[PDB]
A paper describes a structure:
In budding yeast, single‐stranded DNA is coated by replication protein A (RPA) following DNA end resection, and DNA–RPA complexes are then SUMO‐modified by the E3 ligase Siz2 to promote repair. In budding yeast, the response to genotoxic stress is triggered by the formation of single‐stranded DNA and leads to protein group modification by SUMO in a manner that is dependent on the SUMO E3 ligase Siz2 (Cremona et al, 2012; Psakhye & Jentsch, 2012). Our results provide insights on how DNA architecture scaffolds a substrate and E3 ligase to promote SUMO modification in the context of DNA repair.
This was unexpected because an equivalent fragment of Siz1 retains activity and specificity toward substrates such as PCNA in vitro. The structure includes two protomers in the asymmetric unit that share high structural similarity (0.7 Å rmsd over 261 Cα atoms). The structure of Siz2 includes the N‐terminal PINIT domain as well as the SP‐RING and SP‐CTD domains for structures of Siz1.
Author numbering: 153 to 322, 330 to 420
Amino acid sequence: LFTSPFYKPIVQIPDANKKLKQSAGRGCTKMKFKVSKSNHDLLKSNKSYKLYLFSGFSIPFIYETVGHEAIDFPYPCELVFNGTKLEDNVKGLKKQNGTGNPANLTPYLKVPTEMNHLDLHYLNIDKEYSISCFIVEVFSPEALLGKILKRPKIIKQATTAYIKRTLNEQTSTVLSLQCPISCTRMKYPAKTDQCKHIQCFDALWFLHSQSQVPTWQCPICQHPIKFDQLKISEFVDNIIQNCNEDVEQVEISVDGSWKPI
Ligand SMILES: [Zn+2]
């Protein structure tokens, strides 16, 4: 589904749809389609435009839209576009559904006058799938970080109020300045207002992780979050800007004050 911030649709490619039906065993599904010269000119008009293949669960017996499906490729799958195998990690996190990525067909496209062949080899198919192709504008983690930075941060007053309201449980708590993902000093300590914890994670490393495994779960509380909920924490940010690189942890009291450990 186009709920991802890394790619957004510009136009659907016609005659590039396909339904994959259940198969007991071995099989291969073929798709022929052409990409008009106008769509080639559009791809050339902007460096951020790519041709992405999408696969989703095809829920039967009801109406479904072209994009609303969460990205789910049949696992295992071998995708071959114009003879060249696609090395894309199309379906990451095999254990979870909806954590797949699209396949980039842009570099292996043929001229408009010729035909594009997409083969999909499989050993079995337990559920029906919908296959689509879209031209999309892609965004890198750095641009998305820029978007996050331009947002209003989580004010330090809110964090101090939360600390004071929490530590009255029945002495001190440890705030890490390190990122759980990168294991390095955070540069962009971020989280969500939905998160019930003062600990943060580096926004850039989070976006880097999600760009290859779209779980969209907080690396700390594992709650499902969304891109537009990410905001910088002014409290941890100020603590970092006023600390030496040596410090990895910090002691926090009910006062909101903080001491290097
Ligand atoms: Zn959280």
